[PDB]
Design a protein around this ligand. Structure first.
Ligand code: MNH
Length: 184
């Protein structure tokens, strides 16, 4: 992972569970508890994993629900730092453009690998979206979808169609249905 997002995860976790919990968690992996992560710094993925794990044991909160809450909260942050992505759009446009964003974000650092998020209409009021990654950040993905729905103030139902590994890649396909009719 690259530092920019990792740092974002760390701030959010503090915002949610307090500094004590975060710092000791940060200490448990051998980081300085006040570490300053640089945008293009290479942060080991497993190190993040254990930080979240440690937070889970310190709050008694299931680690997958922590990841979902981090996701929910990240949309707000993203809207503040990249408002050009949110302005003049309805939820459906945002979600469908997300794949493009990531493909054109792989430029941020040359080593960045954010997942595919290919979306496609499957009805007048529904789209499929498929998360595809070498990682398995299923709840982070689902959290971000829910947070997008809250931000745009458009209700959705999210139905999970497929989950699991398929040739080297972890995948999660959901069917996203809009209450109000979105397409013609
Ligand atoms: C603006 C909006 C926006 C931005 C700037 C954005 C940018 C990023 C960046 C940068 C990374 C880190 C990539 C890396 O390799 O270090 C990342 C990771 C990620 N992103 Mn997106 N992201 C979304 C919205 C955004 N994401 C939305 C919406 C979703 C889901 C619907 C999403 C799903 C993810 C997931 C899940 C990861 C975790 C990496 C992975 O799963 O492989 N996201």
């Amino acid at each position: 992972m690259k530092g920019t997002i990792v740092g974002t995860w760390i701030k959010t976790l503090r915002d949610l569970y307090g500094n004590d919990v975060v710092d000791e968690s940060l200490k448990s992996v051998g980081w300085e508890p006040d570490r300053v992560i640089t945008p293009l710094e290479d942060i080991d993925d497993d190190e993040v994993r254990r930080i979240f794990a440690k937070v889970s044991e310190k709050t008694g909160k299931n680690v997958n629900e922590i990841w979902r809450e981090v996701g929910r909260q990240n949309i707000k942050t993203f809207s503040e730092w990249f408002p050009s992505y949110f302005a003049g759009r309805r939820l459906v446009n945002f979600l469908m453009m997300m794949d493009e964003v990531h493909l054109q974000l792989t430029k941020m650092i040359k080593g960045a690998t954010p997942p595919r998020l290919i979306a496609k209409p499957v009805a007048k009021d529904a789209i499929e979206m498929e998360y595809v990654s070498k990682r398995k950040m299923y709840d982070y993905f689902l959290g971000l979808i829910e947070g997008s729905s809250k931000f745009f103030k458009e209700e959705i139902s999210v139905e999970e169609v497929e989950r699991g590994e398929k040739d080297g890649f972890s995948r999660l396909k959901v069917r996203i249905k809009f209450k109000n009719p979105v397409f013609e």
